[PDB]
Amino acid sequence: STSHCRFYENKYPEIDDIVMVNVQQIAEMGAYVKLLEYDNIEGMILLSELSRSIQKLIRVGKNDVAVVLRVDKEKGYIDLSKRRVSSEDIIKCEEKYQKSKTVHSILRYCAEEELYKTIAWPLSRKFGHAYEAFKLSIIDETVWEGIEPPSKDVLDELKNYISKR
């Protein structure tokens, strides 16, 4: 359906990627977390990563950035880590995030899911990103390649909606 949807065409992230994740509940040995970039799917962080055996840190609803370790796509289990991220990436993710987040808030205009499959990801395939070279929608016309029609109404919202918000 088109209530909540994905961000990047890879349904899962690869090993050694960097992903923003919002913490939820902490168990006796792990930290059940939801990676919001992929429709808030769940993952787990071993009780071995801090962020300066620190009992005080009981975070609930805080977005954090981590790195994937192992992935089992058939059972959905994911293992992540935190104390292994570097400098730029730890904010490059955030830098990469909100732009990607911004695009998601655009598509829920009538979806409060498929336009990624139609437009966004193939565009993200070309310029490595949607935001990156998104401004070309006013200073170039390479954005016309292989555009697929939805229906009559929301047929052309691109030239109706570029520089905004």
Partner: protein, 316 residues
């Protein structure tokens, strides 16, 4: 896939009755761990808890294992890391499991050759009900050929006293079973009291069988010392507020509502019925000011504040 680990737990009790219930649980988890074939770290900890809780709720939510189960989890959770080979995880994991079982099995021994000199020549000891802890130390003392005598509380409703005296009588030890209502009268004779343990708390408290604090105050009032033997895997993370603030399954000590419409100096067999009994509680709690020394595989601890430092050391 066993899918019925409780049986392995159960089978351990028949392959050896001389092991404590939590010991079988850990000994069963390893069998689950060793046979479990996973691919994510989360997979282990997922079924591990879903195995422990599965093991927990099966045994009336007993406390002894509930400690050991949780401690064991938080043990392997410590020095856990995943580098390159995923199989290293299980390697470091299950190898520490047996290593923990090693200390666990040797724990009930380590206290023996550590608490036996607490018995002196011709001394007289008191014990509330049977406990595997107090048994061995006495035997590991009587083995050293030392004269002493021992009373044993009958320990209603458990009645474990009738078995405790036998285990001592069989091991060439003079006994004298005593009613639960006559412990105070016995303090004049006793030189030192000693009981086992069913659970040690964050404040140094003592969750043991129903009548421990009953005689803990006596020794405190009769100026005789108090000692309790407790294995490491009996430390719990709870923390009460008195001699009462404990979660208990069945509601206890309810009253009846009598509607106006109804119907030898030793009178044996005139007691309460089984229905009357279970209304009464089962466990007891002696605040740490009443104990003068815990007996653990970690050694003898008397501060009952360092127990927390040790308790914090046990958990993460």
């Amino acid at each position: 896939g066993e899918f019925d680990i409780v049986q392995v737990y159960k089978k351990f009790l028949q392959d050896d009755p001389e092991i404590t219930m939590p010991v079988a649980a850990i000994e069963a988890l390893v069998q689950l761990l060793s046979r479990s074939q996973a691919k994510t770290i989360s997979e282990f900890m997922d079924i591990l808890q879903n195995g422990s809780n599965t093991l927990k709720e099966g045994v009336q939510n007993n406390i002894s294992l509930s400690a050991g189960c949780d401690i064991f989890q938080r043990f392997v959770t410590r020095s856990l890391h995943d580098v390159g080979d995923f199989e290293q995880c299980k390697r470091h994991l299950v190898e520490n499991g047996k290593l923990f079982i090693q200390r666990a099995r040797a724990c009930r021994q380590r206290i023996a050759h550590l608490g036996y000199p607490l018995i002196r020549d011709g001394s007289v000891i008191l014990t509330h009900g049977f406990s595997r802890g107090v048994a061995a130390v006495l035997l590991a003392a009587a083995k050293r050929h030392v004269r002493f005598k021992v009373f044993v509380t009958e320990s209603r409703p458990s009645g474990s006293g009738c078995l405790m005296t036998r285990t001592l009588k069989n091991a060439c030890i003079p006994t004298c079973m005593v009613l639960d209502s006559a412990v105070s009268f016995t303090m004049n004779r006793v030189d030192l009291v000693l009981v086992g343990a069913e659970g040690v708390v964050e404040n140094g408290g003592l969750i043991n069988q129903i009548g421990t604090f009953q005689l803990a105050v006596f020794a405190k009032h009769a100026h005789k010392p108090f000692y309790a033997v407790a294995e490491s895997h009996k430390f719990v993370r709870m923390f009460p507020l008195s001699q009462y603030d404990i979660p208990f399954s069945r509601p206890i000590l309810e009253f009846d509502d009598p509607s106006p419409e109804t119907v030898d100096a030793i009178h044996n067999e005139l007691i309460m019925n089984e229905e009357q009994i279970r209304n009464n509680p089962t466990l007891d709690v002696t605040p740490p000011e009443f104990v003068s020394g815990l007996i653990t595989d970690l050694g003898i601890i008397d501060s009952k504040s360092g127990v927390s430092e040790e308790l914090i050391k046990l958990y993460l």
